[PDB]
Amino acid sequence: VNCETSCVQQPPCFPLKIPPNDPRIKNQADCIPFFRSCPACPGSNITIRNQINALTSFVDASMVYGSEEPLARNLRNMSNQLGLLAVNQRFQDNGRALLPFDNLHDDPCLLTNRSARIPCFLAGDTRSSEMPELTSMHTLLLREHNRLATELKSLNPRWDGERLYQEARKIVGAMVQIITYRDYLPLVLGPTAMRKYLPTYRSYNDSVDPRIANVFTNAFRYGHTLIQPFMFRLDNRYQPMEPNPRVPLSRVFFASWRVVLEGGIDPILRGLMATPAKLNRQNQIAVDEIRERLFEQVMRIGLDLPALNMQRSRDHGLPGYNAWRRFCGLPQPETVGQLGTVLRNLKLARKLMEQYGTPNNIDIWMGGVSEPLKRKGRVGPLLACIIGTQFRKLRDGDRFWWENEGVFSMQQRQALAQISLPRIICDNTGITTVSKNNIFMSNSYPRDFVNCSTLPALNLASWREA
Amino acid sequence: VNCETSCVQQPPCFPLKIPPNDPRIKNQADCIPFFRSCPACPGSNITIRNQINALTSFVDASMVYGSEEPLARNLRNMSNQLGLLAVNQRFQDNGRALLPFDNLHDDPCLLTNRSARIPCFLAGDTRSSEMPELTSMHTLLLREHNRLATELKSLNPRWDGERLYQEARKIVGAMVQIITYRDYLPLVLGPTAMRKYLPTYRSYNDSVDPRIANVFTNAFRYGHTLIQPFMFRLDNRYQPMEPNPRVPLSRVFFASWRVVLEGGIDPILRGLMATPAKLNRQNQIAVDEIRERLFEQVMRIGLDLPALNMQRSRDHGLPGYNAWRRFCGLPQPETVGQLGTVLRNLKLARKLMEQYGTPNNIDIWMGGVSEPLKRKGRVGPLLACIIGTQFRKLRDGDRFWWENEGVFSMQQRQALAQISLPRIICDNTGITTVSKNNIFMSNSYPRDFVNCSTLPALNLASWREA
Amino acid sequence: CPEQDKYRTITGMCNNRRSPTLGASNRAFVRWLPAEYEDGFSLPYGWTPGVKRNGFPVALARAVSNEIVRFPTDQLTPDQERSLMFMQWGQLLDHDLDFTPEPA
Amino acid sequence: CPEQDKYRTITGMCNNRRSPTLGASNRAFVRWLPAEYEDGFSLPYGWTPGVKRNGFPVALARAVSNEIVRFPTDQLTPDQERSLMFMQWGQLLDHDLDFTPEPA
Ligand SMILES: *[C@@H]1O[C@H](CO[C@@H]2O[C@@H](C)[C@@H](O)[C@@H](O)[C@@H]2O)[C@@H](O[C@@H]2O[C@H](CO)[C@@H](O[C@@H]3O[C@H](CO[C@H]4O[C@H](CO)[C@@H](O)[C@H](O)[C@@H]4O)[C@@H](O)[C@H](O[C@H]4O[C@H](CO)[C@@H](O)[C@H](O)[C@@H]4O)[C@@H]3O)[C@H](O)[C@H]2NC(C)=O)[C@H](O)[C@H]1NC(C)=O
Ligand SMILES: *[C@@H]1O[C@H](CO[C@@H]2O[C@@H](C)[C@@H](O)[C@@H](O)[C@@H]2O)[C@@H](O[C@@H]2O[C@H](CO)[C@@H](O[C@@H]3O[C@H](CO[C@H]4O[C@H](CO)[C@@H](O)[C@H](O)[C@@H]4O)[C@@H](O)[C@H](O[C@H]4O[C@H](CO)[C@@H](O)[C@H](O)[C@@H]4O)[C@@H]3O)[C@H](O)[C@H]2NC(C)=O)[C@H](O)[C@H]1NC(C)=O
Ligand code: HEM
Ligand code: HEM
Ligand SMILES: *[C@@H]1O[C@H](CO)[C@@H](O)[C@H](O)[C@H]1NC(C)=O
Ligand SMILES: *[C@@H]1O[C@H](CO)[C@@H](O)[C@H](O)[C@H]1NC(C)=O
Ligand SMILES: *[C@@H]1O[C@H](CO)[C@@H](O)[C@H](O)[C@H]1NC(C)=O
Ligand SMILES: *[C@@H]1O[C@H](CO)[C@@H](O)[C@H](O)[C@H]1NC(C)=O
Ligand SMILES: [Ca+2]
Ligand SMILES: [Ca+2]
Ligand SMILES: [Cl-]
Ligand SMILES: [Cl-]
């Protein structure tokens, strides 16, 4: 049963069947590969099938540190008591640290450029090398961990490696929480849904359940509509870096070799700050680089990520569109006319009805990314309700939320409130001119860029234990 | 591991440990036997353990018909096409039907009177012979199903056995729903909780989850505080029936032989109508016949039902008292002063704090039955919230609720609204003076009694298929 | 589930047509609150000696019954407003809704 | 769960002291609505050919992608108020929250 090479529908495979006149796959006997998610209770005919979350639901930088103890220890530098995370011993990005390589049986990254022979990177989460821009964000955070452990060693020379690792890890987890709820989520939800689902923090509530709901694994995939079809690299003058200033995403999936032999992470971080995201429009949902060429270089056929999202919701047994609108307290359209009004687009509504037959059967990612966007938000009301409810739970139900009394001292929180991802890029790369905050909105060079020296640095003075 | 013959704590046993200075079990190395409830996903180290409900959650008389197909077929009289349920082939109660006998390899009924050799009865649910009053109710409904299938055959000579069975079953299921929501639940919850949790029925809602919540299996055990220590039996003149008019409950558990050899079900039904229930009081929670002698005749030691209820909630991993008061939106007492105000009894509050330390640890059945009773109700605010919420879901989430459009005709619904449990007794027994409705309130003979002829009968005219 | 049906199935399956096992027999109970177990997922509070529940030792179920539930039987207060039939319908009704199996 | 802890465990266990595996890794997702499967408990809609989902045939996911998601790349609208960093942080953040394992 190798779901990757076969189209036979035998467990654990659930391959995607091909329609007549498919734009790309002309053989209806072919299929797009698909493995059903691991069930939480194998073989039980008594339980309703449910899936597993291999990560901690908390926003704790687990993609940097790992969510299991063997892996976490292996990511650390155990050759000293400095509390550092291990770095690549063969390559460096202009003298700065790169991630360690993994030792995979069948390494996909080795397939993207066989002469270069650069394996996938190893990080706290298995998907670090999926696209080089993600690797750049993982590399940046690894460097920030080490920069902080170093500074902390100077302030407190008596601290041993464990304490140093734990204190820097605690600061990196708080930085991810602050950038996420202060800067990112307002731009996702827009101002009224933010007020509605994420009112001002009061205190940790142990009766709030912090688990990721099964639907959120599908609903947060709304970000696939933001993907541009290229990876852009800019030089120090924020000009196209030659050669390859724009390379198609189907040539960058698992391409860890571009990080090592094509310039490091700076060209890539510059490309991310000065290039706009793709706007999700009801007639421009997701690009063909991910709809037709996903993992083309390493799979027998290119995958269709929108289609994988729909198949995955069926695999996970998620209710359709109307059940989720009802859950959120939103009117549920029964007719194409009513659906036309909710979507404010009768042509889209009719196409949905032709495919699905009833709004009750629209797969949650398809219905959710089809709704008109909230004002100053990039998600419509169904997605806003699901993402907003999920993030309120992860904040209110986390005993280590950074604002929770006793997690940081009042002095440390005041220091922490000054962090920003513009500053972290300044302290760990060779980039000297960076975007003005909010970094998620800023995208035009030179209008939205400032010099790194005007950014507040994190002042670790309150971590000097006397 | 036989949890009944040993005190070794090893799966599946979870024996109750004995306190110092126990009033009955002087050997602190003995224990009260206890088997953990079967897990829904056995052996998993991924799933949080949960238990199984072997019955249909719906209020469909499944205790009469069974909740599994082989069992339901075996309860039927398959020797003809009359749609009848099988009755006992060796005994009759003054010419009236009795339940068939089951064929249990280890039968507890046989042990209550070894010379009588009368086995346990067979009904849709396995606990029918637990106490003869419960057997009387099970017998009554069997007779009502057969009475009904006979009348329907007269009105509809061409209906076969399957249609007669289904149609009489559908009227018996509606009758249990009407007596429960019209006569029983108002007396349990009292008028303000009835309004709050069971507002007037509007329609079936398919998004209402009708499953029994784990906590309800423990919270509905509030009924153990209503048990009187005797099984009462009265004659046609509602005078004590000689001899044996009051027998200790520790001598009636699993005693099928008393239904068969001591008068049938009429003296038992009469005793249930003209004897008051025990009132639950804060200093008189449950009697010793169930606290000291439960199943004394068939177990190596008498069990303690209050203690099994609390141990069951720990086996089921149920949250403690405050977590359930918070779920219901009720104030959560943190101190003994606050617990004395919630309870309107400071002595009870100090006693609870001495045993539990914190209100967060009081087991749900113990905290629940300790609250002062709502006016004209028999449960306090926490149990009213949990029982009220559960019956609201079983009614709105049931596609076959009797008032749901299309289950019964308008004319049939009007005829069903006339049924009363006093009438079902008049029709299936030799009793001719019965309690005035509401039968759950009425208990004083001759004051609250009426002759059967004053009660309206169920008019089956609307069931004739023209 | 058949598109049309006139009677309930025995098992309760197909009463909810979008999620056909809801309310059907031999299915796990629904949880209104997350479970609380001594190890987080299977062991019951009171299983391991010395393991505290929220900072306080687990009270023995038999000790709580001895202390709070016990009362002199001849002091029983009869409920002037409810008949024993009110207690008996409660058990019969409970048996229509739930039965939690144990190993034999 | 240790009575005093200044750091998070790697696994997330003990973050909620009353129910210590909540939010912890390698645990099943919580469901906000009952699941909807072709057979009621395990099989996905679209498994058996001819089985309808609430009276309508199941649409093929690749057909829905072809007819509604597909668009000409040359018409892409750049979001003038969001940088690509907005997209990337979203993927990084998703990876701190959930990874659903599959068989090899
Ligand atoms: C059919 O019944 C459906 C179920 O109804 C429940 O049970 C029945 C018996 C009744 O008792 C009923 O009163 C119960 O609600 C019913 O659908 C339900 O409808 C409500 C009301 O719209 C929905 O509530 C909304 O929930 C969302 C999502 O958050 C909830 O879930 C998360 C995670 O579980 C929790 O953490 C939250 O606390 C919520 O419980 C909320 O965001 C939303 O609140 C926000 O918006 C409202 C106004 O829209 C504001 O007042 C709030 O302050 C918030 O800002 C609502 O609370 C519920 O999710 C939904 N359940 C289901 C299963 O779909 C349906 O309405 C009934 N239909 C008819 C015609 O009767
Ligand atoms: C700590 O957080 C707790 C969790 O709160 C939820 O999630 C967080 C993230 C916030 O978004 C918060 O807004 C959410 O509510 C919180 O406890 C919660 O408190 C509410 C309000 O008391 C509780 O709701 C009550 O529920 C009962 C029981 O019915 C519910 O359960 C059934 C089965 O699932 C459903 O079908 C029902 O639809 C309900 O969902 C209701 O009977 C009750 O409503 C009745 O009483 C209220 C007053 O309480 C009346 O106004 C109504 O009109 C009704 O007549 C409430 O709906 C909720 O159950 C509870 N959750 C938990 C997990 O305990 C807690 O208060 C927070 N504390 C602080 C200090 O922040
Ligand atoms: C004739 C009177 C009653 C009993 C005898 C009796 C006995 C039990 C026992 C032994 C259990 C199991 C205890 C354990 O957990 O090991 C039990 C459970 C339940 N009861 Fe009991 N009960 C008698 C009477 C009543 C009344 C009047 C009740 C309600 C009004 C009532 C309820 C319940 C419930 C809901 C359960 C749980 C059932 C399940 O398996 O899910 N009982 N009872
Ligand atoms: C570099 C950009 C991104 C990808 C390449 C990519 C790819 C995937 C794939 C292959 C899956 C799994 C498909 C399946 O179900 O079979 C996937 C799932 C998830 N994504 Fe994707 N994604 C890229 C980018 C994003 C962005 C910008 C996201 C959100 C802001 C985003 C989210 C997710 C999530 C939450 C999942 C599910 C993860 C899980 O396993 O639980 N991704 N993505
Ligand atoms: C560990 O730390 C030292 C510097 O402190 C460095 O030279 C060495 O390469 C590090 N080892 C790894 C595996 O990162
Ligand atoms: C592979 O990597 C080499 C450097 O080792 C580079 O020159 C070459 O162009 C890469 N292959 C492709 C297809 O880009
Ligand atoms: C079946 O019905 C007939 C007639 O009512 C009756 O004589 C017979 O005893 C019944 N059989 C059983 C097993 O109940
Ligand atoms: C046992 O049943 C017989 C009839 O078989 C009855 O007379 C006898 O008294 C019963 N035994 C006891 C101990 O009551
Ligand atoms: Ca039932
Ligand atoms: Ca995490
Ligand atoms: Cl529960
Ligand atoms: Cl879900």
mmCIF file with all atom_site columns, N, CA, C and O in Angstrom, chain B residues 9-35:
data_model
loop_
_atom_site.group_PDB
_atom_site.id
_atom_site.type_symbol
_atom_site.label_atom_id
_atom_site.label_alt_id
_atom_site.label_comp_id
_atom_site.label_asym_id
_atom_site.label_entity_id
_atom_site.label_seq_id
_atom_site.pdbx_PDB_ins_code
_atom_site.Cartn_x
_atom_site.Cartn_y
_atom_site.Cartn_z
_atom_site.occupancy
_atom_site.B_iso_or_equiv
_atom_site.pdbx_formal_charge
_atom_site.auth_seq_id
_atom_site.auth_comp_id
_atom_site.auth_asym_id
_atom_site.auth_atom_id
_atom_site.pdbx_PDB_model_num
ATOM 1   N N  . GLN B 1 9  ? -5.216  -4.486 43.833 1.00 0.00 ? 9  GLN B N  1
ATOM 2   C CA . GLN B 1 9  ? -5.514  -3.391 42.939 1.00 0.00 ? 9  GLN B CA 1
ATOM 3   C C  . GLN B 1 9  ? -4.689  -3.631 41.696 1.00 0.00 ? 9  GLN B C  1
ATOM 4   O O  . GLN B 1 9  ? -3.487  -3.381 41.659 1.00 0.00 ? 9  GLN B O  1
ATOM 5   N N  . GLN B 1 10 ? -5.268  -4.170 40.649 1.00 0.00 ? 10 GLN B N  1
ATOM 6   C CA . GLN B 1 10 ? -4.548  -4.431 39.429 1.00 0.00 ? 10 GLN B CA 1
ATOM 7   C C  . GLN B 1 10 ? -5.664  -4.344 38.417 1.00 0.00 ? 10 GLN B C  1
ATOM 8   O O  . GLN B 1 10 ? -6.788  -4.731 38.745 1.00 0.00 ? 10 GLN B O  1
ATOM 9   N N  . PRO B 1 11 ? -5.454  -3.842 37.207 1.00 0.00 ? 11 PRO B N  1
ATOM 10  C CA . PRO B 1 11 ? -6.490  -3.749 36.186 1.00 0.00 ? 11 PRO B CA 1
ATOM 11  C C  . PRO B 1 11 ? -7.189  -5.091 36.028 1.00 0.00 ? 11 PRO B C  1
ATOM 12  O O  . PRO B 1 11 ? -6.505  -6.118 36.026 1.00 0.00 ? 11 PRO B O  1
ATOM 13  N N  . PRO B 1 12 ? -8.519  -5.145 35.975 1.00 0.00 ? 12 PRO B N  1
ATOM 14  C CA . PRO B 1 12 ? -9.414  -3.995 35.909 1.00 0.00 ? 12 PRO B CA 1
ATOM 15  C C  . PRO B 1 12 ? -9.978  -3.555 37.253 1.00 0.00 ? 12 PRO B C  1
ATOM 16  O O  . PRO B 1 12 ? -10.966 -2.825 37.289 1.00 0.00 ? 12 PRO B O  1
ATOM 17  N N  . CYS B 1 13 ? -9.452  -4.011 38.374 1.00 0.00 ? 13 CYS B N  1
ATOM 18  C CA . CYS B 1 13 ? -9.961  -3.640 39.682 1.00 0.00 ? 13 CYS B CA 1
ATOM 19  C C  . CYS B 1 13 ? -9.482  -2.326 40.279 1.00 0.00 ? 13 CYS B C  1
ATOM 20  O O  . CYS B 1 13 ? -8.318  -1.927 40.114 1.00 0.00 ? 13 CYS B O  1
ATOM 21  N N  . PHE B 1 14 ? -10.407 -1.652 40.977 1.00 0.00 ? 14 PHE B N  1
ATOM 22  C CA . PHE B 1 14 ? -10.117 -0.393 41.626 1.00 0.00 ? 14 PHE B CA 1
ATOM 23  C C  . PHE B 1 14 ? -10.859 -0.440 42.951 1.00 0.00 ? 14 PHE B C  1
ATOM 24  O O  . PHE B 1 14 ? -11.780 0.351  43.195 1.00 0.00 ? 14 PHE B O  1
ATOM 25  N N  . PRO B 1 15 ? -10.477 -1.342 43.881 1.00 0.00 ? 15 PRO B N  1
ATOM 26  C CA . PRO B 1 15 ? -11.235 -1.567 45.104 1.00 0.00 ? 15 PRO B CA 1
ATOM 27  C C  . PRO B 1 15 ? -11.262 -0.379 46.011 1.00 0.00 ? 15 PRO B C  1
ATOM 28  O O  . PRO B 1 15 ? -10.314 0.422  46.042 1.00 0.00 ? 15 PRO B O  1
ATOM 29  N N  . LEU B 1 16 ? -12.354 -0.213 46.740 1.00 0.00 ? 16 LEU B N  1
ATOM 30  C CA . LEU B 1 16 ? -12.429 0.912  47.645 1.00 0.00 ? 16 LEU B CA 1
ATOM 31  C C  . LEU B 1 16 ? -11.673 0.552  48.919 1.00 0.00 ? 16 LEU B C  1
ATOM 32  O O  . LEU B 1 16 ? -11.969 -0.494 49.509 1.00 0.00 ? 16 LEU B O  1
ATOM 33  N N  . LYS B 1 17 ? -10.719 1.368  49.360 1.00 0.00 ? 17 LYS B N  1
ATOM 34  C CA . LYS B 1 17 ? -9.957  1.101  50.579 1.00 0.00 ? 17 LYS B CA 1
ATOM 35  C C  . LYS B 1 17 ? -10.801 1.392  51.804 1.00 0.00 ? 17 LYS B C  1
ATOM 36  O O  . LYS B 1 17 ? -11.668 2.269  51.772 1.00 0.00 ? 17 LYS B O  1
ATOM 37  N N  . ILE B 1 18 ? -10.566 0.684  52.909 1.00 0.00 ? 18 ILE B N  1
ATOM 38  C CA . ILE B 1 18 ? -11.344 0.884  54.128 1.00 0.00 ? 18 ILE B CA 1
ATOM 39  C C  . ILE B 1 18 ? -10.710 1.848  55.093 1.00 0.00 ? 18 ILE B C  1
ATOM 40  O O  . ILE B 1 18 ? -9.555  1.636  55.456 1.00 0.00 ? 18 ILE B O  1
ATOM 41  N N  . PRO B 1 19 ? -11.404 2.888  55.565 1.00 0.00 ? 19 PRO B N  1
ATOM 42  C CA . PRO B 1 19 ? -10.930 3.800  56.618 1.00 0.00 ? 19 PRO B CA 1
ATOM 43  C C  . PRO B 1 19 ? -10.666 3.101  57.954 1.00 0.00 ? 19 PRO B C  1
ATOM 44  O O  . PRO B 1 19 ? -11.198 2.016  58.234 1.00 0.00 ? 19 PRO B O  1
ATOM 45  N N  . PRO B 1 20 ? -9.859  3.703  58.813 1.00 0.00 ? 20 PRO B N  1
ATOM 46  C CA . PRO B 1 20 ? -9.805  3.382  60.222 1.00 0.00 ? 20 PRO B CA 1
ATOM 47  C C  . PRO B 1 20 ? -11.169 3.584  60.841 1.00 0.00 ? 20 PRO B C  1
ATOM 48  O O  . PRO B 1 20 ? -11.976 4.426  60.420 1.00 0.00 ? 20 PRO B O  1
ATOM 49  N N  . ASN B 1 21 ? -11.437 2.739  61.813 1.00 0.00 ? 21 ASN B N  1
ATOM 50  C CA . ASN B 1 21 ? -12.701 2.816  62.536 1.00 0.00 ? 21 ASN B CA 1
ATOM 51  C C  . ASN B 1 21 ? -13.969 2.907  61.690 1.00 0.00 ? 21 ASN B C  1
ATOM 52  O O  . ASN B 1 21 ? -14.792 3.828  61.770 1.00 0.00 ? 21 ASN B O  1
ATOM 53  N N  . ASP B 1 22 ? -14.062 1.959  60.777 1.00 0.00 ? 22 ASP B N  1
ATOM 54  C CA . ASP B 1 22 ? -15.197 1.879  59.896 1.00 0.00 ? 22 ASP B CA 1
ATOM 55  C C  . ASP B 1 22 ? -16.290 1.257  60.773 1.00 0.00 ? 22 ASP B C  1
ATOM 56  O O  . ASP B 1 22 ? -15.999 0.320  61.513 1.00 0.00 ? 22 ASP B O  1
ATOM 57  N N  . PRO B 1 23 ? -17.562 1.665  60.727 1.00 0.00 ? 23 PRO B N  1
ATOM 58  C CA . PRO B 1 23 ? -18.634 1.040  61.483 1.00 0.00 ? 23 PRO B CA 1
ATOM 59  C C  . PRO B 1 23 ? -18.945 -0.399 61.117 1.00 0.00 ? 23 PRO B C  1
ATOM 60  O O  . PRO B 1 23 ? -19.709 -1.041 61.834 1.00 0.00 ? 23 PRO B O  1
ATOM 61  N N  . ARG B 1 24 ? -18.387 -0.949 60.047 1.00 0.00 ? 24 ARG B N  1
ATOM 62  C CA . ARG B 1 24 ? -18.707 -2.306 59.704 1.00 0.00 ? 24 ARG B CA 1
ATOM 63  C C  . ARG B 1 24 ? -17.490 -3.093 59.257 1.00 0.00 ? 24 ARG B C  1
ATOM 64  O O  . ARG B 1 24 ? -17.328 -4.247 59.641 1.00 0.00 ? 24 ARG B O  1
ATOM 65  N N  . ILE B 1 25 ? -16.589 -2.548 58.444 1.00 0.00 ? 25 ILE B N  1
ATOM 66  C CA . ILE B 1 25 ? -15.452 -3.308 58.005 1.00 0.00 ? 25 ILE B CA 1
ATOM 67  C C  . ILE B 1 25 ? -14.269 -2.952 58.863 1.00 0.00 ? 25 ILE B C  1
ATOM 68  O O  . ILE B 1 25 ? -13.552 -1.978 58.663 1.00 0.00 ? 25 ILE B O  1
ATOM 69  N N  . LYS B 1 26 ? -14.154 -3.800 59.878 1.00 0.00 ? 26 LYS B N  1
ATOM 70  C CA . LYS B 1 26 ? -13.100 -3.683 60.849 1.00 0.00 ? 26 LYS B CA 1
ATOM 71  C C  . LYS B 1 26 ? -11.742 -4.083 60.287 1.00 0.00 ? 26 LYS B C  1
ATOM 72  O O  . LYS B 1 26 ? -10.708 -3.669 60.817 1.00 0.00 ? 26 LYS B O  1
ATOM 73  N N  . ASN B 1 27 ? -11.662 -4.870 59.216 1.00 0.00 ? 27 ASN B N  1
ATOM 74  C CA . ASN B 1 27 ? -10.362 -5.219 58.702 1.00 0.00 ? 27 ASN B CA 1
ATOM 75  C C  . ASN B 1 27 ? -9.944  -4.203 57.633 1.00 0.00 ? 27 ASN B C  1
ATOM 76  O O  . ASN B 1 27 ? -10.395 -4.234 56.489 1.00 0.00 ? 27 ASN B O  1
ATOM 77  N N  . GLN B 1 28 ? -9.019  -3.307 57.942 1.00 0.00 ? 28 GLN B N  1
ATOM 78  C CA . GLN B 1 28 ? -8.554  -2.308 57.018 1.00 0.00 ? 28 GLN B CA 1
ATOM 79  C C  . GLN B 1 28 ? -7.860  -2.922 55.836 1.00 0.00 ? 28 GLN B C  1
ATOM 80  O O  . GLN B 1 28 ? -7.369  -2.169 55.010 1.00 0.00 ? 28 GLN B O  1
ATOM 81  N N  . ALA B 1 29 ? -7.634  -4.226 55.754 1.00 0.00 ? 29 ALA B N  1
ATOM 82  C CA . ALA B 1 29 ? -6.981  -4.810 54.596 1.00 0.00 ? 29 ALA B CA 1
ATOM 83  C C  . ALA B 1 29 ? -8.101  -5.407 53.712 1.00 0.00 ? 29 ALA B C  1
ATOM 84  O O  . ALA B 1 29 ? -7.848  -6.063 52.697 1.00 0.00 ? 29 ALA B O  1
ATOM 85  N N  . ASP B 1 30 ? -9.384  -5.274 54.077 1.00 0.00 ? 30 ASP B N  1
ATOM 86  C CA . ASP B 1 30 ? -10.451 -5.806 53.255 1.00 0.00 ? 30 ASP B CA 1
ATOM 87  C C  . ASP B 1 30 ? -10.721 -4.643 52.267 1.00 0.00 ? 30 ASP B C  1
ATOM 88  O O  . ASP B 1 30 ? -9.931  -3.683 52.188 1.00 0.00 ? 30 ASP B O  1
ATOM 89  N N  . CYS B 1 31 ? -11.823 -4.619 51.508 1.00 0.00 ? 31 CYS B N  1
ATOM 90  C CA . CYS B 1 31 ? -12.132 -3.558 50.548 1.00 0.00 ? 31 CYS B CA 1
ATOM 91  C C  . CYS B 1 31 ? -13.552 -3.771 50.064 1.00 0.00 ? 31 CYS B C  1
ATOM 92  O O  . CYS B 1 31 ? -14.217 -4.761 50.431 1.00 0.00 ? 31 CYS B O  1
ATOM 93  N N  . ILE B 1 32 ? -14.096 -2.776 49.345 1.00 0.00 ? 32 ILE B N  1
ATOM 94  C CA . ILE B 1 32 ? -15.447 -2.932 48.815 1.00 0.00 ? 32 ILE B CA 1
ATOM 95  C C  . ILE B 1 32 ? -15.089 -3.141 47.334 1.00 0.00 ? 32 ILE B C  1
ATOM 96  O O  . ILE B 1 32 ? -14.298 -2.378 46.735 1.00 0.00 ? 32 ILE B O  1
ATOM 97  N N  . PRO B 1 33 ? -15.518 -4.276 46.766 1.00 0.00 ? 33 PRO B N  1
ATOM 98  C CA . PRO B 1 33 ? -15.203 -4.643 45.403 1.00 0.00 ? 33 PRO B CA 1
ATOM 99  C C  . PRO B 1 33 ? -15.602 -3.564 44.378 1.00 0.00 ? 33 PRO B C  1
ATOM 100 O O  . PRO B 1 33 ? -16.606 -2.844 44.560 1.00 0.00 ? 33 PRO B O  1
ATOM 101 N N  . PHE B 1 34 ? -14.839 -3.440 43.295 1.00 0.00 ? 34 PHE B N  1
ATOM 102 C CA . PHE B 1 34 ? -15.132 -2.441 42.289 1.00 0.00 ? 34 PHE B CA 1
ATOM 103 C C  . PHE B 1 34 ? -14.385 -2.727 41.014 1.00 0.00 ? 34 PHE B C  1
ATOM 104 O O  . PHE B 1 34 ? -13.166 -2.881 41.074 1.00 0.00 ? 34 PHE B O  1
ATOM 105 N N  . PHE B 1 35 ? -15.078 -2.762 39.873 1.00 0.00 ? 35 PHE B N  1
ATOM 106 C CA . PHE B 1 35 ? -14.460 -3.012 38.574 1.00 0.00 ? 35 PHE B CA 1
ATOM 107 C C  . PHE B 1 35 ? -14.586 -1.696 37.829 1.00 0.00 ? 35 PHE B C  1
ATOM 108 O O  . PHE B 1 35 ? -15.642 -1.048 37.839 1.00 0.00 ? 35 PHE B O  1
#
